[PDB]
């Protein structure tokens, strides 16, 4: 089968600025591609094909080029609405397929994360459960990383993590980290803590409790 | 005035099947054949293979071996994907598409999730802190969603009232069943002595859960 590796999941840019995603084919397609745009829920959207023909009704913003294996999507003068995923297609060869897909994100201030650890509840309690919840919200950029610790030695198992995708109004993004243990195990300990690291601090953000 | 359109979301156990219909429309159905491709979250699009209506012409790709079965009724426009021995490995979105290349021409994708699971309400814990040794201007709460199915559930606060500091993050699968949590940042001076309350809404049992957060 033909392979489509698109260069990177994840490209930043700025409103006004030109970011290019590449596509390379595992073989000679010649020039048997297309670019589409996909936003969140919906289906996707043709911007170009047969490498560099636009499509009617798209912005001349974007432009495609290549032939052969290396192919480029280029969009310049970068739009807000533009901050979604683009992947690229083969059509030279049976199966059909498809790159993996780029998203496009806004480039903002670093922002440190906004740390909340909650115990479990009562009520959760009293059903047998406990759950700690750590919150790490409004941080940029996107990378980080949380570790779980338990009358001060790491914990790993039972942790689940969430997180949001860029924040529509402040382009931040948010995380949760849950750490899910029986009430029996929970009973057992003294300090829970939720420590993150982010590129704005040198240092752990460090959240944490005594029962 | 082209347009093409699938059937409703699926939910179905594991070792079933299923079946995903696609009604062309503004064009004559024999013209064009119709490409079927599945969308697992993160992972990429699969071709699955394409029907051609006005041929009898039927390709499918080798990696869903005796899986799918792609039919068309030319009386009503409607090509279909009977797919076979689901797991939950299937679960995804599968779109029906015009031509190899379709340009916009795409169905609005149809939800297929395949599941063990039972129909079940959130069980909804509160999230707040105890005593805290400093004084803080703002104060933050949350909301545990916990053991539903199927997705999705919605969650607002003081019913929408509340609506900046707020972060809903996407549910996990935990046990086999959803959960998810939801956080509130506010000023402390408004909680506790003005009531704060989350509002989950589980479409699937008709349920709706309105949890007080107190002290
Ligand atoms: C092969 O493709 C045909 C349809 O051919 C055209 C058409 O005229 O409809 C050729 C035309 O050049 C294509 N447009 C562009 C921009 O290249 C056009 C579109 O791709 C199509 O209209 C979008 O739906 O396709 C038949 O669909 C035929 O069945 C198909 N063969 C297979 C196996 O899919
Ligand atoms: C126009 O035709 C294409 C496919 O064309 C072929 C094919 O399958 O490649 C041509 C091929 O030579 C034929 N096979 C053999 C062994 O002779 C084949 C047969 O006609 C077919 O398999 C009989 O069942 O057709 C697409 O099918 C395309 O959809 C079609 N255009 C339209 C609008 O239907």
């Known amino acids: 089968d033909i392979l489509m590796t698109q260069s990177h999941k994840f490209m930043s840019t700025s409103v006004g600025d030109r970011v290019s995603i590449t596509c390379k084919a595992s073989?000679?397609?010649?020039?048997?591609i297309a670019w589409y745009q996909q936003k969140p829920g919906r289906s996707p959207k043709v911007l170009i094909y047969?490498?560099?023909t636009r499509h009617t009704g798209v912005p001349d913003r974007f432009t495609g080029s290549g032939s052969g294996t290396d192919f480029t999507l280029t969009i310049s003068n970068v739009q807000s609405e533009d901050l979604t995923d683009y992947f690229c297609?083969?059509?030279?060869?049976?199966?059909?397929?498809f790159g993996v897909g780029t998203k496009l994100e806004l480039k903002r201030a670093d922002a440190a994360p906004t740390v909340s650890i909650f115990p479990p509840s009562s009520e959760q309690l009293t059903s047998g459960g406990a759950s700690v919840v750590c919150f790490l919200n409004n941080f940029y950029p996107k990378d980080i990383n949380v570790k779980w610790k338990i009358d001060g030695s790491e914990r790993q198992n039972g942790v689940l993590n969430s997180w949001t995708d860029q924040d529509s109004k402040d382009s931040t993004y948010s995380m949760s980290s849950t750490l899910t243990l029986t009430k029996d195990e929970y009973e057992r300990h003294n300090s829970y803590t939720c420590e993150a690291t982010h590129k704005t601090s040198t240092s752990p953000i460090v959240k944490s409790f005594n029962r | 005035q082209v347009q093409l359109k699938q059937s409703d979301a699926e939910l179905v156990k594991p070792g079933a099947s299923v079946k995903i219909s696609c009604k062309a429309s503004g064009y004559t159905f024999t013209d064009h054949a119709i490409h079927w491709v599945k969308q697992k979250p993160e992972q990429g699009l699969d071709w699955i293979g394409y029907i051609s209506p006005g041929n009898g012409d039927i390709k499918y790709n080798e990696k869903f071996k005796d899986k799918v079965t792609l039919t068309a009724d030319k009386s009503s426009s409607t090509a279909s994907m009977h797919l076979n021995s689901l797991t939950s490995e299937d679960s995804a979105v599968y779109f029906c598409?015009?031509?190899?290349?379709?340009?916009?021409?795409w169905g609005q994708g149809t939800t297929l999730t395949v599941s063990s699971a039972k129909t079940t309400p959130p069980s909804v814990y509160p999230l707040a802190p105890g005593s805290a040794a400093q004084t803080n201007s703002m104060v933050t709460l949350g909301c545990l969603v916990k053991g539903y199915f199927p997705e999705p559930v919605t969650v607002t606060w003081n019913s929408g009232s509340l609506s900046s500091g707020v972060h809903t993050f996407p549910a996990v699968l935990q046990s086999d069943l959803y959960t998810l949590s939801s956080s509130v940042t506010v000023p402390s001076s408004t909680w506790p002595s003005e009531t704060v309350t989350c509002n989950v809404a589980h479409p699937a049992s008709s349920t709706k859960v309105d949890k007080k957060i107190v002290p």
């Open positions: 297609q083969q059509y030279s060869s049976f199966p059909l397929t």
């Open positions: 598409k015009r031509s190899l290349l379709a340009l916009d021409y």
């Open positions: 047969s490498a560099s």
């Open positions: 073989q000679d397609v010649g020039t048997n």
